[PDB]
UniProtKB/Swiss-Prot annotation:
Its EC number is 3.4.13.-. This is Putative dipeptidase SACOL1801. InterPro entries: Bact_exopeptidase_dim_dom, M20A_pepV-rel, Peptidase_M20, Peptidase_M20A. Keywords: Dipeptidase, Hydrolase, Metal-binding, Metalloprotease, Protease, Zinc. The active site is at D87, E150 (proton acceptor). The keyword Hydrolase applies.
Length: 433
């Protein structure tokens, strides 16, 4: 395309830069490591080499303990990350050429690291340099993140991500769980009430059943309470209507034979953002809170009100947590049930960004709850993670690709190399410009 010519104007500089990087015997050497070169002198030089060309070309860089680092470009809130590495495996068995003296041929360039990774690392960097030469007007920051330690897999756990910013999206071809934003974390768990089989006076109201929602991460738009009314009913009915209008709610009340049936409609919406909908079940419990109920029903209504009502962002559970780009901890109450025999239950869906402290928070709350006769039953934990095929950059790469088109004696084709730059080039452009 136009992209392809563009690169062709940088052919010699790409080759030169590449040669320079292949010529470094950046092989792991644990026995000669130091604090200055934690995996040995080679990889350290290869990482330094990258910072030099970055500087030569005017990019800011940032080093992390001389094991990994980044070359920075672009402008804006979002950060696209491209993760690569400059360490290389040993050459070893029967090379027809010097593995760390690159030979550039007519069609091809021959050396260790041509394929993994030095070639793609250079392609990526040149896509960025080319775009920069255009003096193009960026809308995203780009972090070319460069590692040296084969032992790490780019986890939010590993040395770089302990302290450096997490890319909001990106490409990390060789890691299964890179620290890149992707999928919100998500769990479920039940809050279960301990039944209280004790003795008490007859109550103005006995809650017989309550049901709202189902076991989906949706905001329930329907709730029903069936209540035994000791004395008269005109007051409760009148108050329910008032409550419905004060809260701008559709709902309704039905009587038969001493049983009052209270019904509240809400607004279903996905549980991944509950603030947007209206939880019928929580609203109905909110109203029950004003009544003299039997003990168990009253503790159950009370619990909803202390921890649940009007707390879409985990606030009343001690779990508010805000992320600069990745969103907030979110709590949807998808299911609420109650009956005489089993007492009460609340099903919670809790969505979190990396890296909210999940189990620590649970434990704290798990205990706070003890005093109220409520326990936590843990559902499935699905931690935040990156999904390569959902990633908007990986996708532009596949599109850009479509638009265009440990061995011995490893080599890379000139054409493979320039094409790789064209495709990085197109994709990065479309996405950050």
């Amino acid at each position: 395309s136009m992209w392809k010519e563009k690169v062709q104007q940088y052919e010699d500089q790409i080759i030169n830069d590449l040669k320079g990087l292949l010529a470094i015997e950046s092989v792991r050497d644990d026995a000669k490591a130091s604090e200055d070169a934690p995996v040995g002198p080679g990889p350290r030089k290869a990482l330094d080499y990258m910072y030099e060309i970055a500087h030569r070309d005017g990019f800011t860089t940032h080093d992390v303990d001389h094991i990994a680092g980044r070359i920075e470009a672009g402008k804006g809130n979002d950060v696209l990350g491209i993760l690569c590495h400059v360490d290389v495996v040993p050459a070893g068995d029967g090379w027809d050429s010097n593995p760390f003296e690159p030979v550039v041929t007519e069609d091809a360039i021959i050396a260790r690291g041509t394929l993994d990774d030095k070639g793609p690392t250079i392609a990526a960097y040149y896509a960025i340099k080319i775009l920069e030469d255009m003096n193009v007007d960026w809308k995203k920051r780009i972090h070319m993140i460069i590692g040296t330690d084969e032992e790490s897999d780019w986890k939010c756990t590993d040395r770089y991500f302990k302290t450096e910013e997490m890319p909001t999206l990106g490409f990390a071809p060789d890691a299964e769980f890179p620290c890149i934003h992707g999928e919100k974390g998500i769990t479920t768990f039940d809050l279960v009430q301990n039944k209280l089989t004790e003795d008490q006076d007859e109550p103005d109201y006995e809650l017989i059943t309550f049901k709202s929602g189902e076991r989906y991460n949706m905001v329930p738009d329907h709730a029903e309470a069936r209540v035994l009314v000791k004395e008269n009913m005109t007051d409760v009915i009148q108050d329910f209507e008032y409550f419905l209008e004060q809260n701008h709610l559709q709902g309704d009340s039905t009587v038969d034979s001493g049983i009052l049936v209270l019904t509240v409609e809400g607004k279903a919406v996905h549980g991944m953002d509950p603030s947007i909908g209206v939880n019928a079940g929580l609203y109905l419990l909110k109203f029950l809170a004003s009544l003299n109920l039997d003990n168990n029903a009253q503790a159950f209504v009370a619990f909803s009100n202390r921890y649940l009502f009007n707390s879409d962002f985990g606030e009343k559970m001690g779990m508010k947590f805000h992320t600069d780009v990745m969103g907030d901890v979110t709590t949807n109450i998808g299911v609420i049930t109650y009956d005489n025999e089993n007492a009460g239950l609340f099903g919670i869906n809790l969505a979190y960004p990396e890296g909210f402290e999940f189990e620590k928070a649970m434990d704290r709350f798990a205990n706070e709850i003890q005093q109220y006769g409520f326990e936590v039953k843990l559902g499935k934990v699905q931690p935040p993670h990156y999904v390569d095929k959902n990633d908007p950059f990986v996708q532009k790469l596949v599109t850009a690709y479509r638009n265009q088109t440990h061995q011995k004696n490893e080599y890379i084709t000139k054409k493979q190399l320039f094409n790789a730059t064209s495709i990085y080039l197109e994709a990065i452009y479309s996405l950050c410009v």
